[PDB]
Design a protein around this motif. Structure first.
Motif, PDB file in Angstrom:
ATOM      1  N   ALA A  50      34.132  50.054  42.443  1.00 22.04           N
ATOM      2  CA  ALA A  50      34.526  49.662  43.789  1.00 22.04           C
ATOM      3  C   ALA A  50      34.402  48.164  44.057  1.00 22.04           C
ATOM      4  CB  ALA A  50      33.674  50.397  44.771  1.00 22.04           C
ATOM      5  N   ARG A  51      33.321  47.559  43.579  1.00 21.88           N
ATOM      6  CA  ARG A  51      33.134  46.133  43.700  1.00 21.88           C
ATOM      7  C   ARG A  51      34.182  45.391  42.879  1.00 21.88           C
ATOM      8  NH1 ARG A  51      28.716  44.734  41.259  1.00 21.88           N
ATOM      9  NH2 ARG A  51      28.108  46.806  40.515  1.00 21.88           N
ATOM     10  N   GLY A  52      34.336  45.758  41.612  1.00 25.63           N
ATOM     11  CA  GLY A  52      35.383  45.163  40.783  1.00 25.63           C
ATOM     12  C   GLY A  52      36.755  45.269  41.437  1.00 25.63           C
ATOM     13  N   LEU A  53      37.108  46.468  41.890  1.00 22.62           N
ATOM     14  CA  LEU A  53      38.380  46.698  42.574  1.00 22.62           C
ATOM     15  C   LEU A  53      38.552  45.875  43.839  1.00 22.62           C
ATOM     16  CD1 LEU A  53      39.466  50.396  42.683  1.00 22.62           C
ATOM     17  CD2 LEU A  53      40.836  48.406  42.006  1.00 22.62           C
ATOM     18  N   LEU A  54      37.627  46.022  44.769  1.00 18.02           N
ATOM     19  CA  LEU A  54      37.608  45.225  45.993  1.00 18.02           C
ATOM     20  C   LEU A  54      37.709  43.728  45.743  1.00 18.02           C
ATOM     21  CD1 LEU A  54      34.961  47.145  48.023  1.00 18.02           C
ATOM     22  CD2 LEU A  54      37.348  46.651  48.724  1.00 18.02           C
ATOM     23  N   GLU A  55      36.865  43.216  44.868  1.00 19.49           N
ATOM     24  CA  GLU A  55      36.911  41.809  44.557  1.00 19.49           C
ATOM     25  C   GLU A  55      38.287  41.428  44.040  1.00 19.49           C
ATOM     26  OE1 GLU A  55      35.354  39.333  45.545  1.00 19.49           O
ATOM     27  OE2 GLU A  55      33.863  38.554  44.088  1.00 19.49           O
ATOM     28  N   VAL A  81      48.758  36.952  37.526  1.00 22.72           N
ATOM     29  CA  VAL A  81      48.103  37.274  38.762  1.00 22.72           C
ATOM     30  C   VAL A  81      46.871  38.103  38.551  1.00 22.72           C
ATOM     31  CG1 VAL A  81      48.348  38.735  40.818  1.00 22.72           C
ATOM     32  CG2 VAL A  81      50.148  37.033  40.145  1.00 22.72           C
ATOM     33  N   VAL A  82      46.992  39.158  37.779  1.00 21.60           N
ATOM     34  CA  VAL A  82      45.889  40.097  37.574  1.00 21.60           C
ATOM     35  C   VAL A  82      44.809  39.487  36.668  1.00 21.60           C
ATOM     36  CG1 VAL A  82      45.256  42.377  36.669  1.00 21.60           C
ATOM     37  CG2 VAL A  82      47.362  42.102  37.907  1.00 21.60           C
ATOM     38  N   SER A  83      45.240  38.730  35.650  1.00 19.69           N
ATOM     39  CA  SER A  83      44.325  38.031  34.712  1.00 19.69           C
ATOM     40  C   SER A  83      43.556  36.934  35.393  1.00 19.69           C
ATOM     41  CB  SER A  83      45.101  37.411  33.568  1.00 19.69           C
ATOM     42  OG  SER A  83      46.133  36.620  34.107  1.00 19.69           O
ATOM     43  N   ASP A  84      44.232  36.229  36.301  1.00 20.44           N
ATOM     44  CA  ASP A  84      43.602  35.184  37.108  1.00 20.44           C
ATOM     45  C   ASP A  84      42.485  35.808  37.937  1.00 20.44           C
ATOM     46  OD1 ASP A  84      45.441  33.443  35.922  1.00 20.44           O
ATOM     47  OD2 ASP A  84      46.177  32.597  37.812  1.00 20.44           O
ATOM     48  N   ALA A  85      42.799  36.864  38.688  1.00 17.50           N
ATOM     49  CA  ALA A  85      41.788  37.642  39.426  1.00 17.50           C
ATOM     50  C   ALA A  85      40.602  38.070  38.576  1.00 17.50           C
ATOM     51  CB  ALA A  85      42.412  38.847  40.043  1.00 17.50           C
ATOM     52  N   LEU A  86      40.873  38.795  37.503  1.00 16.13           N
ATOM     53  CA  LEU A  86      39.815  39.217  36.569  1.00 16.13           C
ATOM     54  C   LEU A  86      38.961  38.031  36.119  1.00 16.13           C
ATOM     55  CD1 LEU A  86      41.956  41.713  34.637  1.00 16.13           C
ATOM     56  CD2 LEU A  86      40.128  42.341  36.186  1.00 16.13           C
ATOM     57  N   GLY A  87      39.596  36.868  35.959  1.00 14.26           N
ATOM     58  CA  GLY A  87      38.887  35.657  35.569  1.00 14.26           C
ATOM     59  C   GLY A  87      37.770  35.247  36.518  1.00 14.26           C
ATOM     60  N   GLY A  88      37.925  35.579  37.804  1.00 12.86           N
ATOM     61  CA  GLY A  88      36.945  35.244  38.843  1.00 12.86           C
ATOM     62  C   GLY A  88      35.849  36.265  39.129  1.00 12.86           C
ATOM     63  N   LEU A  89      35.837  37.386  38.414  1.00 10.17           N
ATOM     64  CA  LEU A  89      34.753  38.330  38.569  1.00 10.17           C
ATOM     65  C   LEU A  89      33.470  37.716  38.007  1.00 10.17           C
ATOM     66  CD1 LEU A  89      36.126  41.860  37.660  1.00 10.17           C
ATOM     67  CD2 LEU A  89      35.619  40.945  39.899  1.00 10.17           C
ATOM     68  N   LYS A  90      32.601  37.251  38.892  1.00 11.15           N
ATOM     69  CA  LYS A  90      31.286  36.787  38.471  1.00 11.15           C
ATOM     70  C   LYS A  90      30.336  38.006  38.379  1.00 11.15           C
ATOM     71  CE  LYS A  90      31.620  31.842  40.202  1.00 11.15           C
ATOM     72  NZ  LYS A  90      30.638  30.693  40.604  1.00 11.15           N
ATOM     73  N   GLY A  91      29.104  37.772  37.951  1.00 14.96           N
ATOM     74  CA  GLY A  91      28.057  38.795  37.978  1.00 14.96           C
ATOM     75  C   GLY A  91      28.043  39.715  36.775  1.00 14.96           C
ATOM     76  N   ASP A  92      27.672  40.973  37.022  1.00 16.87           N
ATOM     77  CA  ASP A  92      27.761  42.048  36.023  1.00 16.87           C
ATOM     78  C   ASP A  92      29.202  42.459  35.733  1.00 16.87           C
ATOM     79  OD1 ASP A  92      28.123  43.377  38.594  1.00 16.87           O
ATOM     80  OD2 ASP A  92      27.874  45.297  37.540  1.00 16.87           O
ATOM     81  N   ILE A 124      44.255  43.350  27.647  1.00 23.87           N
ATOM     82  CA  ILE A 124      43.043  44.090  27.910  1.00 23.87           C
ATOM     83  C   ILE A 124      42.005  43.146  28.489  1.00 23.87           C
ATOM     84  CG2 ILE A 124      41.172  45.443  26.833  1.00 23.87           C
ATOM     85  CD1 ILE A 124      43.211  46.100  24.626  1.00 23.87           C
ATOM     86  N   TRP A 125      41.185  43.678  29.385  1.00 22.77           N
ATOM     87  CA  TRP A 125      40.081  42.916  29.954  1.00 22.77           C
ATOM     88  C   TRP A 125      38.879  43.827  30.123  1.00 22.77           C
ATOM     89  CZ3 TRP A 125      36.775  43.420  33.768  1.00 22.77           C
ATOM     90  CH2 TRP A 125      35.979  42.328  34.095  1.00 22.77           C
ATOM     91  N   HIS A 126      37.697  43.336  29.789  1.00 20.28           N
ATOM     92  CA  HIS A 126      36.521  44.177  29.832  1.00 20.28           C
ATOM     93  C   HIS A 126      35.313  43.333  30.062  1.00 20.28           C
ATOM     94  CE1 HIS A 126      35.615  42.726  25.826  1.00 20.28           C
ATOM     95  NE2 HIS A 126      34.528  43.471  25.789  1.00 20.28           N
TER      96      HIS A 126
END
Lengths: 383, 373
Positions: free
Chosen positions: B248-253, B151-162, B211-213
């Motif tokens: 905040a953007r990372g979290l919110l997204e 669930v969390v890795s899937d979400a992190l996978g969709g963070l576009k941008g910076d 880990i994700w970065h």
């Protein structure tokens, strides 16, 4: 009037139950043992895991409680291969038979059809325990014992621990003669006594080993724990250490005979005083006595001598012999001294393995002397 | 056997906390145990599971009072409320009646937050989060933990941008990645400290952790260490506002993408976001900077101001190598009672005054009227 028994049936382990919670398949909880080197990983299949995952002992022990310590401890590809699991209670074996039989087999080469014989602690039937203090420096006999009807350390409550301490110290309370001695709880140990016990070497402290901890055998410490030693200071009993009861008869010198007489008399009498109260030792009809670790069953007996063999050491057939004799050596010392004991634990009675020690040691000294005198030992080797 | 009174049993299963020094061991009365001993959360969490870490870790008189209890799931709090309310009050000075406001991550309403580098050498903001519906690390199953990862890795996978980045699961970690993550100071390992081992949080390692970065390497996230999610936004220099933007953007997204798939964050109505350890509650937000107070630092009323500003300070905590002498880790003290960005604003309002007073001393003048009356 067992409301309390019903609560633990469902709540010993205070962990979430993946299986009941609507949907998760047994596959979804199956541990990843690819990188594991312990008997549990070797013997555990997803079929066995499916069979047992939701199967719970009347005490409320789970399969995951039994195998956790092995999941948590993959161990080294180089180090020794640990057992990787634990009995939670007297029911755990029967309850997860298909699995435990595969470990017992690997650990003790003891087949599912095999049968551990009845207990025999008739020290009067022991032939020849006396050795020259020259070759035998010290000797001791140890074993572990569990109290029937009570969970084993991995899954036991502060209350049971307390129960077990009350039962076993009271029982030791009634021992007499050469076996009389006093009890020292750990909770109330003044430093005045602690100083002495440290000097005698009788003191045990909180476990910090991987197994003990990860198994939950260091909970609520030092509650329920304690030491008992006789007034002669040659017969020591530990309580709620790794197992409910851990007994050790021991002394300096070659008199294994006397060590066993004392051990047998102690253990028999404690079983008996326990029985005058409606408490007994936890005993399985096939596997002998039980303890938390599947390596400690059958007789649960380790008898050893500290043996000095300056000439025999360097003989090429030294180990093939030791192994022939069904003994194992612990510590190529420049002192030529070894800790030699019965390898076996199941399939022989307690005084049989003791007699196995004695017999072996007789043969061992007979060669040390012979080699020293320059004679051959090739026809002395058991065939 | 125990053919006992539930009453008599609790007597016979009540821990001796005489020589213990932890919150749990100070707020746990025999009545409270007797009341909650056989009460069980909807996910099978017992009361002894919650307090075991405190029992098993009496803690000596040299180390500072630990919490000594843990939430096993989202139900644990409310389920043993009369217990947890006194711990919370000792830890956070947050009374049973008190309420924590709604979440607020609108970085655009953060006023200021860009500080001179001459004074602010670094800054960072971390928090922890739990996925709702699932048990916390102390009680969670391997399935649950595997689940939390997807669930969390899937979400992190969709963070576009910076906020773009890649996951690195520990389970199937190769040696170049290990070598890199270590190098960046991003890897964590199997915990060996008491709280995490005795509490059940080190089980089934490394299964389920990763880990994700982001590719800028200024937005870090840990999956299943001490909590389901730990997220850190960090960089060197004095752009706190930028740090809070990223965070905040990372979290919110992330929450938004998770909502997209029918999961969410563990949020209690009175106490805000929930984690294994009760000290991690409310916003669960640690905002901090590394301030160099060459002059303020040797001042009598220095700790008094820090107090009145609701700020905390330590030595240059974990930078830990070169001569870095008038530098302190100033963070928001509080965790409850203020929103996620009100606290960052508290950090900014403080550090501003801190700096202000450092300069006013530097010019040889008095700072007596600046310090909150």
């Amino acid at each position: 009037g067992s409301a309390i028994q019903d609560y633990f049936v469902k709540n010993r382990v205070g962990h979430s139950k993946p299986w009941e919670s609507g949907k998760f398949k047994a596959a979804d909880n199956f541990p990843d043992l690819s990188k594991h080197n312990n008997v549990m990983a070797s013997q555990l299949t997803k079929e066995l895991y499916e069979k047992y995952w939701d199967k719970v002992t009347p005490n409320g022990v789970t399969f995951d409680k039994c195998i956790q310590t092995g999941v948590d401890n993959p161990g080294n590809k180089f180090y020794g291969k640990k057992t990787g699991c634990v009995f939670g209670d007297e029911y755990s074996y029967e309850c997860y038979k298909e699995f435990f039989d595969k470990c017992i087999e690997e650990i003790h080469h003891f087949k599912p059809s095999d049968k551990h014989p009845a207990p025999d602690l008739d020290h009067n039937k022991l032939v020849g325990g006396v050795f020259e203090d020259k070759y035998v420096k010290s000797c001791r006999i140890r074993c572990g014992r569990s109290v029937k009807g009570v969970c084993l350390p991995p899954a036991m409550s502060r209350a049971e621990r307390r129960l077990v301490e009350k039962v076993v110290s009271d029982a030791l309370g009634g021992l007499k003669g050469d076996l009389a001695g006093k009890y020292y709880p750990l909770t109330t140990m003044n430093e005045k006594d602690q100083e002495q016990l440290i000097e005698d070497h009788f003191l045990f402290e909180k476990p910090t080993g991987a197994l003990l901890t990860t198994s939950g055998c260091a909970r609520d410490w030092p509650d329920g724990r304690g030491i008992w030693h006789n007034n002669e200071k040659n017969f020591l009993v530990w309580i709620n250490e790794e197992d409910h009861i851990r007994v050790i008869s021991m002394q300096k010198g070659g008199d294994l005979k006397a060590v066993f007489s004392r051990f047998a008399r102690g253990l028999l009498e404690v079983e008996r005083l326990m029985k005058e109260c409606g408490h007994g030792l936890m005993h399985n009809d096939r596997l002998g006595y039980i303890c938390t670790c599947p390596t400690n069953m059958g007789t649960v007996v380790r008898a050893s001598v500290h043996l000095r063999l300056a000439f025999l050491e360097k003989h090429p057939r030294f180990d093939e012999m030791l192994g022939k004799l069904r003994l194992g050596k612990r510590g190529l010392a420049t002192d030529s001294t070894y800790d030699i004991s019965n390898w076996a634990r199941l399939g022989k009675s307690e005084r049989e393995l003791v007699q196995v020690l004695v017999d072996g040691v007789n043969l061992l000294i007979a060669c040390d002397k012979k080699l020293e005198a320059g004679q051959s030992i090739d026809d002395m080797i058991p065939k």
